[PDB]
């Protein structure tokens, strides 16, 4: 009962598909169906009664963002055409445009430990690994079903989690892609997000209205979390050392502690409409979180007693 | 369709 609620500490008044903090939790960026990446200063948003400091127009609708963990000013995007772009938010220019995917790319992630490396996944059923110093993909994994999410392990660039429309999480060692290390079954519908709490703890979300926790050292199921409604949309998943947060098709943000299967708290986003939460992001291991919904509203929330 | 998870 350390926390019982989420307090709204700021609000910026369509769909925001991604909201992410930079390397220092100083700036954050949003992107979505409006074909624009917007960058905001977190402290200005919290202190003021609102305007992005940078906006970059894109050719296609955006599905995902990932900031570089070493180069402060670099951010990757994935788009509905399949293009994976690395941008510099100071110059506004695209640095790399990776165009090998043949269909919509749903996810991109920059590695924390080898920061020139990034991974993407697509409706074309491929996972591609890229290096910012090379135009062609470094690794290609041909899979059997649409890839909805990819994420690097936070401790090593050799491991990625891949969430698939086949309902499973495929956990790969990129040093030998002939077979995954392990494939985690349990979800009853597509796996829409994968996020690591730590080197050995992986969380997932699915359109079976569950989150699940997995042990990637010993290849074990750990826990299933329930309470929210997620049968259709990408509603967002974010985790830290202790907590999982996700969206819902009821326009509510849910928070779970990793040891407890039902929610610690929830927040009705408000504005009538069938809105859905569409993106969430913790501010590292703190109780502060960014959230956004299908109307494009952004809120800064904080877990509170 | 916008931000709808694929269902095969």
Numbering used by the authors:
A (entry chain A): 351 to 363, 372 to 407, 411 to 632, 642 to 675
B (entry chain B): 57 to 64
Authors' description from the paper:
We mapped putative VP motifs in all these proteins and assessed their binding affinities to the COP1 WD40 domain. We could detect binding for most of the peptide motifs in ITC assays, with dissociation constants in the mid‐micromolar range. Next, we obtained crystal structures for the different peptides bound to COP1 (1.3–2.0 Å resolution, see Tables EV1 and EV2, and EV4) to compare their peptide binding modes. We found that all peptides bind in a similar configuration with the VP forming the center of the binding site (r.m.s.d. between the different peptides range from ~ 0.3 to 1.5 Å, comparing 5 or 6 corresponding Cα atoms). In yeast 3‐hybrid assays, we find that, similar to HY5, UV‐B‐activated UVR8 can efficiently compete with HYH and an N‐terminal fragment of HFR1 for binding to COP1.
